[PDB]
Amino acid sequence: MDKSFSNYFWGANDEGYHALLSRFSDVKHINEELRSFYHERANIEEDYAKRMAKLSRTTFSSLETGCLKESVQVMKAEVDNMAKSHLQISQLLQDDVENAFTRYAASLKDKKKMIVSGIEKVHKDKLSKHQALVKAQDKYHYLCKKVNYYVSQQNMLFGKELEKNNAKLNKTQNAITASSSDYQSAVAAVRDSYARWTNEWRSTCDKLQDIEEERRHFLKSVMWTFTLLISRSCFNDDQACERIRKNLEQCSVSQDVLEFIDAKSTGTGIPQPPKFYDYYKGEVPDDSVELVQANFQR
Amino acid sequence: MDKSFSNYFWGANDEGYHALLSRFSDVKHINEELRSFYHERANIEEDYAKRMAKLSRTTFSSLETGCLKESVQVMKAEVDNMAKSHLQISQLLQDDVENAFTRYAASLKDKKKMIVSGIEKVHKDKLSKHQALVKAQDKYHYLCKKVNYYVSQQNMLFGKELEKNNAKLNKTQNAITASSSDYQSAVAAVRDSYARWTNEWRSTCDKLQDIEEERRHFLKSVMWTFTLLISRSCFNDDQACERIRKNLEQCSVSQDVLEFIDAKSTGTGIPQPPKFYDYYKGEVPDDSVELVQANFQR
């Protein structure tokens, strides 16, 4: 005996019928919870991306020089690259994760419509025949019961009331044939309906088991996709960080200081103190600052 | 000739003196710009973490079953772990990156007060001696021009006008010898002051260059730290994703469905159709629902 919905969702009152149908709302509930969860997770990522992009738009002054200035620019460009990545990730979190639940809820609605329709008609007919069977069985039952009574009256009745009784008895006996006939027809019709019901519910159970099995594969894959997206985000950001470090590694402080000196130098000549100007040896005061070239060791 | 601050920041008007001193203001503004940048970056990270922790506090319904139910909890728990990680990272960004500039700013301020202390006095003495020189220089040549006036008017003059003239000539000629010595004394003093200034400014230059070198090593170090922190964040999140994937790998859909069937089964008995009970001969309904156990294949 196989372990499937086909063999384990029956019951004397179609318990499996009402159960598996009502489960559709539980599946929908679970699906909506996760959609809502990942909806927020995506917006969190988007906001993060947006703020990081805004930060990348920061303008610095022109006060820094050399490769150190370049490093700040590279760093800002790479923070921007991280923003772009996170924005792309948030978009995928919405489209491939969040919206996957949305597309599932839309698909499930159609699946339920197709399944519920093609089984509730069969079920309604099953109950319809069964009602007709009980109604027919009852008529035939209490007709036989009246015959029993009318015969028992023959022992104590007399006169015109005995013949009136025997008239009722005779009329009731002739009703038995048709009543028994309609009853047996009701038995036959209910048998066929049950036979059709057994086959149809089996078919429905197979389809309902498919949905459940696909549901669990779906939920696993989406959560899997979620981790793939975040791991990708980590790879991207780490690569950006590595590029910042590579740029920093190539940034020589001593070379920067050299270039700083060349660009900011104010003079290599040391001003000499003013000398004595003897009025008599033709000497005359001048303003030309004598310069002696600096020649110190660091 | 070494390429150092000590050899390249002179100039006839002490341009290098004023340039390297106002340099402190630029260095401070660069540091503040970066501090502000990483403050926002740390802030973005903190908001990210806080919002992600709030999300992981979501409560899901207990409608889900099996390993899948466990996987959803593992997923949400690892989302929680990522939030905690991003929170600590934001704290380290604040204390080790952002606050690094704050610690540097304090040390730079106290360092500046010492450089400015030991050089501004020396510079004023240079300017003070120079003012004393130009004043003595002017007095000397003004007297020389005046002795020259009375001399050129000698032969042109006569008697009592000559005597009045020559009297002012003697008084002036006398003063010239004295002012010439004061002029020379000033020249001697100024050359001493310029010598001290030269030796002191080169010393200060060497210190200022140490500061500039220190500064560039510092900013690179803090940027480096920034990348290590983000990379560490990437690592933690990726590990969290791995752990989620380890759990999904071990979760079996088949087993979940098998356990679902076991828990939710509503019966294995197929209800059989009601039979015809010949009431007319005393055949009484056995109101039992005959159950033929299902044996369908999947």
Short mmCIF file of all heavy atoms in Angstrom, two decimals, chain B residues 262-287:
data_model
loop_
_atom_site.label_atom_id
_atom_site.label_comp_id
_atom_site.label_asym_id
_atom_site.label_seq_id
_atom_site.Cartn_x
_atom_site.Cartn_y
_atom_site.Cartn_z
N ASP B 262 1.09 11.30 7.62
CA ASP B 262 0.96 10.61 8.90
C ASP B 262 0.21 11.44 9.93
O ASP B 262 -0.59 10.91 10.70
CB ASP B 262 2.33 10.23 9.44
CG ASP B 262 2.94 9.05 8.72
OD1 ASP B 262 2.17 8.21 8.21
OD2 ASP B 262 4.18 8.96 8.67
N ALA B 263 0.47 12.74 9.95
CA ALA B 263 -0.12 13.62 10.94
C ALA B 263 -1.54 14.03 10.58
O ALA B 263 -2.39 14.18 11.46
CB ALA B 263 0.75 14.86 11.13
N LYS B 264 -1.80 14.20 9.29
CA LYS B 264 -3.06 14.78 8.84
C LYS B 264 -4.05 13.77 8.26
O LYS B 264 -5.16 14.15 7.88
CB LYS B 264 -2.78 15.88 7.81
CG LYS B 264 -1.87 16.99 8.31
CD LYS B 264 -2.56 17.89 9.31
CE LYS B 264 -1.69 19.09 9.66
NZ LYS B 264 -2.39 20.07 10.54
N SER B 265 -3.65 12.50 8.18
CA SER B 265 -4.50 11.47 7.59
C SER B 265 -5.87 11.40 8.24
O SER B 265 -5.99 11.41 9.46
CB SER B 265 -3.82 10.10 7.69
OG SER B 265 -4.59 9.11 7.03
N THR B 266 -6.91 11.34 7.41
CA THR B 266 -8.28 11.36 7.90
C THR B 266 -8.95 10.00 7.77
O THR B 266 -10.15 9.87 8.00
CB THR B 266 -9.12 12.41 7.15
OG1 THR B 266 -9.15 12.08 5.75
CG2 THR B 266 -8.52 13.79 7.33
N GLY B 267 -8.17 8.99 7.39
CA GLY B 267 -8.69 7.65 7.26
C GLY B 267 -8.28 6.97 5.97
O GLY B 267 -8.05 7.63 4.96
N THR B 268 -8.19 5.65 6.01
CA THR B 268 -7.81 4.87 4.84
C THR B 268 -9.00 4.08 4.30
O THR B 268 -8.88 3.36 3.30
CB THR B 268 -6.65 3.90 5.16
OG1 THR B 268 -7.05 3.00 6.19
CG2 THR B 268 -5.43 4.68 5.64
N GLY B 269 -10.14 4.22 4.96
CA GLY B 269 -11.34 3.48 4.58
C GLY B 269 -12.24 4.21 3.60
O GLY B 269 -12.74 5.30 3.88
N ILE B 270 -12.45 3.60 2.43
CA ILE B 270 -13.35 4.14 1.43
C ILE B 270 -14.79 3.76 1.75
O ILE B 270 -15.12 2.58 1.81
CB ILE B 270 -12.99 3.65 0.01
CG1 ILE B 270 -11.54 3.98 -0.32
CG2 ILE B 270 -13.94 4.25 -1.02
CD1 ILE B 270 -11.08 3.45 -1.66
N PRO B 271 -15.65 4.77 1.96
CA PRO B 271 -17.06 4.54 2.28
C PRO B 271 -17.79 3.84 1.14
O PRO B 271 -17.75 4.31 0.00
CB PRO B 271 -17.61 5.95 2.50
CG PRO B 271 -16.41 6.79 2.80
CD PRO B 271 -15.31 6.20 1.98
N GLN B 272 -18.44 2.72 1.44
CA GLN B 272 -19.17 1.96 0.43
C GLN B 272 -20.62 2.41 0.35
O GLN B 272 -21.19 2.84 1.36
CB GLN B 272 -19.08 0.46 0.72
CG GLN B 272 -17.67 -0.11 0.63
CD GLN B 272 -17.00 0.20 -0.70
OE1 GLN B 272 -15.90 0.75 -0.74
NE2 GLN B 272 -17.66 -0.17 -1.79
N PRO B 273 -21.23 2.31 -0.84
CA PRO B 273 -22.63 2.72 -1.04
C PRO B 273 -23.63 1.88 -0.24
O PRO B 273 -23.41 0.69 -0.03
CB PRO B 273 -22.85 2.51 -2.55
CG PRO B 273 -21.80 1.52 -2.95
CD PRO B 273 -20.62 1.84 -2.10
N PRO B 274 -24.71 2.51 0.23
CA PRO B 274 -25.76 1.83 0.99
C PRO B 274 -26.51 0.81 0.14
O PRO B 274 -26.80 1.09 -1.03
CB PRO B 274 -26.70 2.97 1.41
CG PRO B 274 -25.88 4.22 1.26
CD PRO B 274 -24.98 3.95 0.10
N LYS B 275 -26.81 -0.35 0.71
CA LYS B 275 -27.45 -1.42 -0.05
C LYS B 275 -28.98 -1.41 0.09
O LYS B 275 -29.53 -0.69 0.92
CB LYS B 275 -26.90 -2.78 0.39
CG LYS B 275 -25.70 -3.26 -0.43
CD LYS B 275 -24.97 -4.40 0.27
CE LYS B 275 -23.98 -5.10 -0.67
NZ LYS B 275 -24.68 -5.94 -1.68
N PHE B 276 -29.64 -2.20 -0.74
CA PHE B 276 -31.08 -2.34 -0.71
C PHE B 276 -31.50 -3.27 0.42
O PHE B 276 -31.14 -4.44 0.43
CB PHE B 276 -31.59 -2.86 -2.06
CG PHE B 276 -33.08 -3.10 -2.11
CD1 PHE B 276 -33.94 -2.08 -2.49
CD2 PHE B 276 -33.61 -4.34 -1.81
CE1 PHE B 276 -35.30 -2.29 -2.55
CE2 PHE B 276 -34.98 -4.56 -1.87
CZ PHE B 276 -35.82 -3.54 -2.23
N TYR B 277 -32.27 -2.75 1.37
CA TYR B 277 -32.77 -3.56 2.46
C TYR B 277 -34.24 -3.88 2.25
O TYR B 277 -35.10 -3.01 2.37
CB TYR B 277 -32.56 -2.86 3.80
CG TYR B 277 -31.11 -2.61 4.14
CD1 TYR B 277 -30.52 -1.38 3.89
CD2 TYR B 277 -30.32 -3.61 4.69
CE1 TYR B 277 -29.19 -1.15 4.18
CE2 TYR B 277 -28.99 -3.39 4.99
CZ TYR B 277 -28.43 -2.15 4.73
OH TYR B 277 -27.10 -1.92 5.03
N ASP B 278 -34.52 -5.14 1.94
CA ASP B 278 -35.88 -5.60 1.70
C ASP B 278 -36.71 -5.59 2.99
O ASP B 278 -36.88 -6.63 3.63
CB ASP B 278 -35.87 -7.01 1.09
CG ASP B 278 -37.18 -7.38 0.43
OD1 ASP B 278 -38.24 -7.24 1.08
OD2 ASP B 278 -37.16 -7.82 -0.74
N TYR B 279 -37.21 -4.41 3.36
CA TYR B 279 -38.04 -4.23 4.55
C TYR B 279 -39.24 -5.15 4.55
O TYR B 279 -39.77 -5.51 5.60
CB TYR B 279 -38.55 -2.79 4.67
CG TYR B 279 -37.53 -1.75 5.07
CD1 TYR B 279 -37.21 -0.70 4.22
CD2 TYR B 279 -36.92 -1.79 6.32
CE1 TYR B 279 -36.30 0.27 4.58
CE2 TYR B 279 -36.00 -0.83 6.69
CZ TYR B 279 -35.70 0.20 5.82
OH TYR B 279 -34.78 1.16 6.19
N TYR B 280 -39.68 -5.51 3.36
CA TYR B 280 -40.92 -6.26 3.18
C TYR B 280 -40.82 -7.69 3.70
O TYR B 280 -41.82 -8.39 3.78
CB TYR B 280 -41.31 -6.27 1.71
CG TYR B 280 -42.76 -6.59 1.44
CD1 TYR B 280 -43.77 -5.94 2.13
CD2 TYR B 280 -43.11 -7.52 0.47
CE1 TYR B 280 -45.10 -6.23 1.88
CE2 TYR B 280 -44.44 -7.81 0.21
CZ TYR B 280 -45.42 -7.16 0.92
OH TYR B 280 -46.75 -7.43 0.68
N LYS B 281 -39.60 -8.12 4.05
CA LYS B 281 -39.40 -9.46 4.59
C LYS B 281 -38.66 -9.42 5.92
O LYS B 281 -38.31 -10.46 6.48
CB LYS B 281 -38.63 -10.32 3.59
CG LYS B 281 -37.15 -9.98 3.48
CD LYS B 281 -36.51 -10.67 2.29
CE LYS B 281 -35.02 -10.43 2.21
NZ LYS B 281 -34.40 -10.85 0.93
N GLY B 282 -38.41 -8.21 6.41
CA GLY B 282 -37.76 -8.04 7.70
C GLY B 282 -36.26 -7.88 7.61
O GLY B 282 -35.54 -8.10 8.58
N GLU B 283 -35.77 -7.50 6.43
CA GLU B 283 -34.35 -7.25 6.23
C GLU B 283 -34.03 -5.85 6.74
O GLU B 283 -34.33 -4.86 6.07
CB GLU B 283 -33.96 -7.40 4.76
CG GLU B 283 -32.47 -7.61 4.53
CD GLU B 283 -32.11 -7.83 3.08
OE1 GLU B 283 -32.60 -7.07 2.22
OE2 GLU B 283 -31.33 -8.76 2.79
N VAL B 284 -33.46 -5.78 7.93
CA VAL B 284 -33.23 -4.51 8.61
C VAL B 284 -31.88 -3.91 8.23
O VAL B 284 -30.90 -4.63 8.10
CB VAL B 284 -33.29 -4.71 10.14
CG1 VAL B 284 -33.59 -3.41 10.86
CG2 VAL B 284 -34.35 -5.75 10.49
N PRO B 285 -31.84 -2.58 8.03
CA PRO B 285 -30.59 -1.87 7.74
C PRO B 285 -29.49 -2.13 8.77
O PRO B 285 -29.70 -1.98 9.97
CB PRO B 285 -31.00 -0.40 7.79
CG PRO B 285 -32.42 -0.40 7.45
CD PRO B 285 -32.99 -1.67 7.99
N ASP B 286 -28.32 -2.52 8.27
CA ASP B 286 -27.10 -2.48 9.05
C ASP B 286 -26.47 -1.13 8.75
O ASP B 286 -25.72 -1.00 7.79
CB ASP B 286 -26.17 -3.64 8.70
CG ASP B 286 -25.11 -3.88 9.76
OD1 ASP B 286 -24.86 -2.96 10.58
OD2 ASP B 286 -24.53 -4.99 9.78
N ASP B 287 -26.79 -0.13 9.56
CA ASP B 287 -26.41 1.26 9.27
C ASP B 287 -24.90 1.50 9.31
O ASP B 287 -24.45 2.65 9.34
CB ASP B 287 -27.09 2.21 10.25
CG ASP B 287 -28.51 1.81 10.56
OD1 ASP B 287 -28.78 0.59 10.73
OD2 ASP B 287 -29.37 2.71 10.66
#
